[PDB]
From a paper:
Cytochromes [name] oxidise hydroxylamine within the nitrogen cycle and contain as their active site an unusual catalytic c-type haem where the porphyrin is crosslinked to the protein via a lysine residue in addition to the canonical cross links from cysteine residues. Cytochromes [name] consist of a homodimer with one haem [name] per monomer. The oxidation of hydroxylamine is a key part of the process of nitrification, whereby fixed nitrogen is converted to biologically available forms such as nitrate, in a range of bacteria. Here we describe the evidence for a novel double crosslink between lysine and haem in the [name] from [name] (Bath).
Numbering used by the authors:
A (entry chain B), B (entry chain A): 18 to 77, 78A, 79 to 161
């Protein structure tokens, strides 16, 4: 198993099998991202129960470097896998970080991010800008 | 329930719950895409059984117009849903179109695309360029 994050969160097993919530592309990072969630998160996302998200919801964002497809240069496609970011909802347990447990694992080798157990204050530094939306930027993508 | 495509392919039920294969962004369409697959496709993708893909594999590409996140302008995120494109592998049934059944549904209204039953020749026009990769451009995104 990969090492736990410095705040004690273990890597959610099976996240690559989870359902999609959305996708994104971060210009400044030259990354394509997929956002998945466990079934608690997906149910909440689809039913709009995101104020707050429920206890047990886990979101995962998977980031790859952007490359261009060798056969179709206008298609930006994933190259190198760069990291997996997680938010785990537990209003009581992570009340000090807004009710979410943050954790990041880097690369194929899955090195836990962060110098110490307060690393999540970095995450909060930006995610506080989405405080009105329970610290979550992502808007579930529309589907029929 | 949505009408079948002009070549007789019915919309696959439950595609929104399928596992992810990849993501992409098409620069000339200003979209973001998620590529999902049924469990045959996902197993094939993950094992590298793509030369050729096995019969029964279904790939779906979901497309949204790109929007910029209101709280974070360098984040391109899905706006309106534009289309669902499908490729259904059946080397015998779809031998005339490279072993793949193509189909597209447009919009939230899931209107079948295509003027007639030969609409898939359009798809083949470009997809023939990926013939070395069994007519599939997408490279499964690498995950640990
Ligand atoms: Fe973040
Ligand atoms: Fe295509």
């Amino acid at each position: 198993e990969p090492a736990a994050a410095p705040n004690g969160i273990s890597l959610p097993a099976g996240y690559k099998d989870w359902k999609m919530i959305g996708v994104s592309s971060r210009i400044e990072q030259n990354n394509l991202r997929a956002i998945l969630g466990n079934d608690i998160a997906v149910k909440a996302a689809r039913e709009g129960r995101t104020h707050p998200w429920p206890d047990g919801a886990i979101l995962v964002k998977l980031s790859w470097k952007k490359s261009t497809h060798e056969l179709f240069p206008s298609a930006e496609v994933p190259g190198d896998f760069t990291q997996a970011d997680f938010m785990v909802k537990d209003a009581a347990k992570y009340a000090s970080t807004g009710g979410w447990g943050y954790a990041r694992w880097l690369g194929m080798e899955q090195k836990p991010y962060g110098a110490n157990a307060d690393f999540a204050q970095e995450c909060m530094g930006c995610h506080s800008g989405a405080k009105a939306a329970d610290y979550v930027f992502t808007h579930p993508a529309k589907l029929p």
